Amino acid sequence: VNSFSGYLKLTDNVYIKNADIVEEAKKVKPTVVVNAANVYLKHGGGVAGALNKATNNAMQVESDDYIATNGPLKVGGSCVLSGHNLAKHCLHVVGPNVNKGEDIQLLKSAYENFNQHEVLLAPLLSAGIFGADPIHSLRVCVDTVRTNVYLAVFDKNLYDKLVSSFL
Numbered sequence: 001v002n003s004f005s006g007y008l009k010l011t012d013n014v015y016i017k018n019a020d021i022v023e024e025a026k027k028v029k030p031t032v033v034v035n036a037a038n039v040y041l042k043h044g045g046g047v048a049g050a051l052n053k054a055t056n057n058a059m060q061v062e063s064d065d066y067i068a069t070n071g072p073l074k075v076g077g078s079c080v081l082s083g084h085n086l087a088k089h090c091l092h093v094v095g096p097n098v099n100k101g102e103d104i105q106l107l108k109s110a111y112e113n114f115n116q117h118e119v120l121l122a123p124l125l126s127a128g129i130f131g132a133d134p135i136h137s138l139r140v141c142v143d144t145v146r147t148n149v150y151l152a153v154f155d156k157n158l159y160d161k162l163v164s165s166f167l
């Protein structure tokens with residue numbers, strides 16, 4: 001039993017809710033919140049900008065030190081950093097950005113990072129400003145992630161479409 005509430009069960013291990021991931025993280029304090037990161041960990045907008053804003057920019061300060069030490073992430077890769085006031089840990093995962101011409105096949109590699117964590121609160125990777133089809137992203141998630149994932153979808157219209165079209 002865990003503290004996630006109000007989710008629709010899609011599969012054995014994938015759950016979904018119309019929710020603001022920032023507000024959901026603030027209430028649940030999950031072990032792991034996933035950020036929709038880019039390779040530079042520049043958290044300017046979308047989910048990343050919202051999460052970072054909720055940390056009062058502490059996420060960005062920590063991220064800048066990480067990059068200065070380690071260099072950029074790979075598209076499809078991840079790193080574990082602090083969850084600040086939102087979660088124990090933040091798993092920064094880089095899905096391909098279609099608006100940058102990155103290969104969508106890398107979306108499966110991106111979701112594989114979730115399998116290193118037993119339970120996660122997450123957005124749909126490569127959705128929103130990353131330009132991928134969220135229906136496709138959900139399919140890859142379900143077919144790739146084997147650990148327990150609680151997906152937060154900000155847009156109510158999109159949430160209803162994801163549920164209604166789910167096979």
Ligand SMILES: O=C(O)[C@@H]1C[C@H]2CC[C@@H]1CN(c1ncnc3nc[nH]c13)C2
Pocket residue numbers: 019020021022046047048050123124126127128129130134152153154155156158
């Ligand atoms: O989930 C959505 O509605 C869409 C799919 C992804 C890209 C575009 C939007 C928003 N984006 C998000 N942006 C900011 N906070 C969020 N909390 C959950 N998801 C959030 C996620």
